Design a protein around this ligand. Structure first.
Ligand SMILES: CCCCCCCCCCCCCCCCC[C@@H](O)O[C@H](CO[C@H](O)CCCCCCCCCCCCCCC)COP(=O)(O)OCC[N+](C)(C)C
Lengths: 70, 175
């Protein structure tokens, strides 16, 4: 009676544990991958991250400058 | 009693002597057992029969749960968490079953020692030998794993034991 009205079967806890373990393992793998990607992006500068501004080339004036040699 | 398997818990045929009175004096033990029977065993038996018939009026069943076999730790990938979870649960169940096997053998040994009397040293050799074998196997499997034991540590211990055995065999063959 106690088992029938207060508890469930073993398979429920078993499969809930499986799902929880899958989620946690995926999160750990993602954390490691994110750290490695951050290291590579900061070292190389070839990714979307750690982009530091340079002078906009639209500010340059392309006209004759009263002197032939610029 | 049918409540347990006679092969799992063996017993000798229990040969008992016959009463051979030598004198005409009536022994008090027999009379005391007769009055004990009349005053105790009959009412207890009647109450038991009443309770048993009440239980027979309401008969229902429960079952032993069967467990499938799953791949063990020896065929799990390094980081495949689901397979290690299943293998760990299976290994823990096997560990419990082995503990109960050792318990059964120990019960056999204790019953033999009590039953044999003054000749237990000679008449309980088989039980002692069985307990020695089972204890050796259990010690090889599970000793020194620690409180944080796991299937991986048991596999590591077995691998180291097999490496030592292989080295010793190669050394003895190449002697
Ligand atoms: C002959 C009898 C011998 C045995 C006596 C047994 C005594 C039982 C009392 C002990 C209670 C144990 C505590 C249980 C509380 C937690 C369990 C909880 O999960 O159960 C919930 C049920 O809650 C219970 O109703 C709680 C009972 C607590 C009340 C105790 C009774 C007496 C308290 C006195 C109250 C004040 C009296 C008035 C004074 C003026 C439903 O949760 P649920 O997630 O669905 O379960 C899923 C499993 N399913 C599928 C089977 C449903």
């Amino acid at each position: 009676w106690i088992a029938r009205t207060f508890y469930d079967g073993p398979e429920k806890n078993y499969e809930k544990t499986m799902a929880i373990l899958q989620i946690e393992a995926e999160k750990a793998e993602l954390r490691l991958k994110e750290l490695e990607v951050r290291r590579l992006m900061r070292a190389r500068g070839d990714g979307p991250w750690y982009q530091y501004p340079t002078i906009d080339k639209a500010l340059i004036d392309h006209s004759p400058k009263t002197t032939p040699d610029n | 009693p049918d409540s347990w398997d006679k092969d799992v818990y063996p017993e000798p045929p229990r040969r008992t002597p016959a009463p051979a009175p030598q004198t005409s004096l009536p022994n008090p033990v027999t009379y005391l057992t007769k009055i004990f029977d009349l005053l105790v065993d009959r009412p207890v038996t009647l109450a038991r029969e009443f309770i048993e018939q009440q239980h027979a009026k309401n008969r229902y069943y429960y079952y032993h749960r069967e467990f499938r076999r799953v791949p063990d730790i020896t065929e799990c990938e390094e980081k495949d968490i689901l397979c290690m979870f299943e293998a760990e649960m299976q290994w823990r169940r096997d560990y419990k079953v082995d503990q109960e096997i050792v318990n059964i053998i120990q019960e056999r040994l204790k019953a033999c020692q009590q039953r044999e009397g003054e000749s237990y040293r000679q008449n309980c050799a088989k039980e002692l030998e069985q307990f020695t074998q089972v204890s050796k196997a259990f010690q090889d499997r599970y000793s020194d794993l620690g409180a944080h034991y796991s299937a991986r540590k048991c596999l590591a211990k077995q691998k180291q034991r097999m490496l030592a055995e292989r080295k010793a065999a190669k050394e003895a063959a190449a002697a």
